[PDB]
C-alpha cells in the first residue's frame, strides 16, 4: 500500500515555506487613509483592531475603521512613516522567528500571545498588546 502514504508525502510537501499588496495611503485635510487596511490585514491573518491598535499607538493618534474596511487616522501623516511603523508591526507580530514566513496565526491565553507558523510550525511568544 503506497497510495495512502504517497498521498501523505504530497500533503506535507505542500505545507513548506504573496508579495504584500501595496498599502494605498492618502490625505484629506488632516486625515491619513489606508484604502485597503482591511484587505491588507486580511492577507496576513491579523485582526484589524490589532494592527490598528499597534499602528495607532505607535502613531500616538486616534482613529477607527471604515464600515468598508478603511483606516481613518485622525491626523495627517506622511505615507512613508506609516510603512516604517507597519513593517515594524510585521516583524514583531506576524513574522516567524524560526524561518520568517509571515504565514502565521496569533494565539492568546491568559497573558501570553504567540505567533504560530503554518510553514515551520514554531511559536514566537509576543508581548500581548
Amino acid at each position: 500500500s503506497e497510495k495512502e502514504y504517497v498521498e501523505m508525502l504530497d500533503r506535507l510537501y505542500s505545507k513548506l515555506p504573496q508579495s504584500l499588496p501595496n498599502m494605498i495611503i492618502l490625505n484629506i485635510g488632516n486625515t491619513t487613509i489606508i484604502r485597503n487596511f482591511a484587505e491588507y490585514c486580511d492577507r496576513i491573518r491579523r485582526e484589524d483592531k490589532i494592527c490598528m491598535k499597534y499602528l495607532l499607538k505607535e502613531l500616538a493618534a486616534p482613529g477607527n475603521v471604515d464600515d468598508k474596511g478603511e483606516l481613518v487616522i485622525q491626523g495627517k501623516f506622511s505615507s512613508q512613516v506609516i510603512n516604517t511603523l507597519m513593517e515594524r508591526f510585521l516583524k514583531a507580530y506576524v513574522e516567524c522567528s524560526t524561518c520568517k514566513s509571515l504565514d502565521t496565526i496569533l494565539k492568546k491565553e491568559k497573558k501570553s500571545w504567540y505567533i504560530v507558523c503554518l510553514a515551520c510550525g514554531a511559536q514566537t511568544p509576543v508581548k500581548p498588546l
Binding site: 495512502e4 501523505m8 508525502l9 500533503r11 506535507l12 513548506l16 515555506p17 515551520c120 510550525g121 514554531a122
Partner: protein, 409 residues
C-alpha cells in the same frame, strides 16, 4: 488525566524530542544545562488533547485545540481523548533508561531520520527491544524529509518497507514528517488515532504503579512553614489511586549496620494527585502522574526512588534478592555498529537486569536452557507473575541489550 502512554523510540538526534514539540508544543526543557548543550537526558514529558474535525476532511481534520475553523469550518471539533508521550533519549548509552521507560508505554512511534543510513545502531536496538517487551502497537515515522531529495525519502521508505517484512511489522505504516516545520503532523495524529488504540484496564485490580522520577518541589529558600511534600513521578499500569489513600514504596530504603545491607518498605499518605499542571482527585492508567506525599523531600530529591514502585499499603508483594528467570537470546547484538554473535551465558557473570522501570545489576548463579537464577545488588519487588524483563551485558565498556525472558515465582 491522559488516557494512554505513547513512546517515541529511535536513534540519536533523528529528532525525537522535536517531533514531540511539533505535536504538543512542549519541549523536554533539555535541562541540567548539560542537556541544553547535549540533548534529552531524562525521559522528557508532555501531554495533549486530540479532537477531530467531524465537519470536514481528514487528515487535517485531526485537531489539537478545540478549534475546527482551521480547516473546513467552525463546529468545535469533538474531543476523542487526551494522550501523553514519553520522550526517551537517543544516545547509544541511555539504553538503560529507555528500556526502563518502555514499562509505562502503551505503544510507540519510531522516528527514523530521512537523511542518514536507515538501520542506524540505536534505531535497531530500540525496534527489537519493542518487539521483545510486547509493545506491538507501532508507527514508524520518516522525520527529516524537509532536507532531502524527493527520491531519497521514497528509497528509504523502500528499505523500511523491506525491513518491516520478515519481522512482526506487517502494516506498521510509515508517515514521513517534518518535525522542524511541523509539516504533515495531522496525518500522524490520524495514524496515532487509528493504530495506537487506548487499552481497557480493569480498575478492580490491585493498585500498582512504576516510578521514573521524583522531585523536591521546594524552591531554594521556602520557609519551613510551607515546605511542600515529597513528590513521586511515574506511571500507573493497573488499579487506580485516590487522594488520601495509605501507600507504600518498594523495595524501599536500605539501612546501614557496619557493612550490612537491608532494604525495607516506605509508607506515607498520598498528599496530592497531579497530571500535567492540573490537579485531580484520582488517577488511572496511561499517563504519568505525580504524587504529592508527606515524606521528607530529602528522601526523593534528585530522583532517588528511581526504579521503585508504589502500591496499596498492606499489600502482598515480594522483595526478592534472588530470582528465577526463564529466558531467550538474540542471535546478534543489534546495538553495536558491529553485529557480533551473542555468546551464551556463562555463570558468575555480571548482567544488567532491567525489570519494570527499575534498573538493577546482578550475578548468574545458575545456567540452564532457559532458566537461570540471579543474585541481585538491589532488591526487586515482583508485583505479579507476569513480570517482563530485559537482559544486558557490558560488551565493550558500554552495555548492550542481548536477550530477555520472564521473571518466575
Amino acid at each position: 488525566q491522559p488516557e494512554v502512554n505513547i513512546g517515541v523510540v529511535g536513534h540519536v538526534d533523528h529528532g525525537k524530542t522535536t517531533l514531540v514539540q511539533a505535536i504538543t508544543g512542549i519541549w523536554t526543557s533539555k535541562h541540567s544545562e548539560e542537556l541544553k548543550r547535549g540533548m534529552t537526558i531524562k525521559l522528557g514529558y508532555a501531554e495533549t488533547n486530540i479532537g477531530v474535525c467531524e465537519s470536514c476532511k481528514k487528515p487535517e481534520a485531526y485537531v489539537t485545540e478545540p478549534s475546527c475553523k482551521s480547516c473546513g469550518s467552525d463546529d468545535e471539533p469533538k474531543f476523542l481523548r487526551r494522550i501523553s508521550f514519553i520522550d526517551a533519549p537517543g544516545h547509544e548509552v541511555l539504553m538503560a533508561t529507555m528500556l526502563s521507560g518502555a514499562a509505562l508505554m502503551d505503544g510507540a512511534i519510531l522516528v527514523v531520520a530521512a537523511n542518514e543510513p536507515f538501520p542506524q545502531p540505536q534505531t535497531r536496538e530500540h525496534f527489537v527491544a519493542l518487539g521483545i517487551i510486547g509493545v506491538k502497537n507501532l508507527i514508524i515515522v520518516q522525520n527529516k524529509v524537509d532536507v532531502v531529495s524527493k527520491e531519497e525519502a521514497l528509497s528509504q521508505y523502500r528499505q523500511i518497507k523491506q525491513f518491516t517484512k520478515g519481522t512482526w511489522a506487517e502494516n506498521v505504516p510509515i508517515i514521513p514528517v517534518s518535525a522542524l516545520h511541523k509539516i504533515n503532523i495531522d496525518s500522524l495524529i490520524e495514524g496515532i488515532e487509528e493504530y495506537i488504540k487506548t487499552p481497557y484496564r480493569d480498575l478492580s485490580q490491585k493498585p500498582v504503579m512504576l516510578v521514573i522520577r521524583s522531585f523536591d518541589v521546594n524552591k531554594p529558600g521556602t520557609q519551613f512553614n510551607e515546605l511542600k511534600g515529597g513528590v513521586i513521578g511515574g506511571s500507573i499500569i493497573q488499579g487506580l489511586f485516590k487522594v488520601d489513600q495509605e501507600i507504600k514504596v518498594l523495595p524501599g530504603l536500605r539501612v546501614e549496620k557496619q557493612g550490612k545491607v537491608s532494604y525495607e518498605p516506605i509508607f506515607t499518605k498520598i498528599s496530592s494527585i497531579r497530571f500535567g499542571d492540573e490537579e485531580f482527585k484520582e488517577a488511572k492508567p496511561g499517563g504519568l502522574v505525580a504524587i504529592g506525599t508527606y515524606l521528607d523531600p530529602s528522601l526523593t530529591k534528585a530522583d532517588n526512588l528511581l526504579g521503585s514502585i508504589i502500591t496499596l499499603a498492606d499489600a502482598e508483594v515480594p522483595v526478592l534478592w534472588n530470582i528465577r528467570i526463564k529466558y531467550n537470546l538474540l542471535e546478534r547484538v543489534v546495538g553495536a555498529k558491529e553485529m557480533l554473535k551473542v555468546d551464551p551465558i556463562r555463570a558468575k557473570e555480571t548482567l544488567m537486569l532491567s525489570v519494570g522501570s527499575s534498573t538493577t545489576l546482578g550475578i548468574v548463579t545458575s545456567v540452564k536452557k532457559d532458566e537461570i537464577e540471579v543474585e541481585l545488588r538491589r532488591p526487586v519487588a515482583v508485583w505479579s507473575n507476569n513480570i517482563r524483563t530485559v537482559i544486558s551485558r557490558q560488551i565493550a565498556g558500554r552495555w548492550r541489550m542481548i536477550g530477555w525472558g520472564l521473571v518466575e515465582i
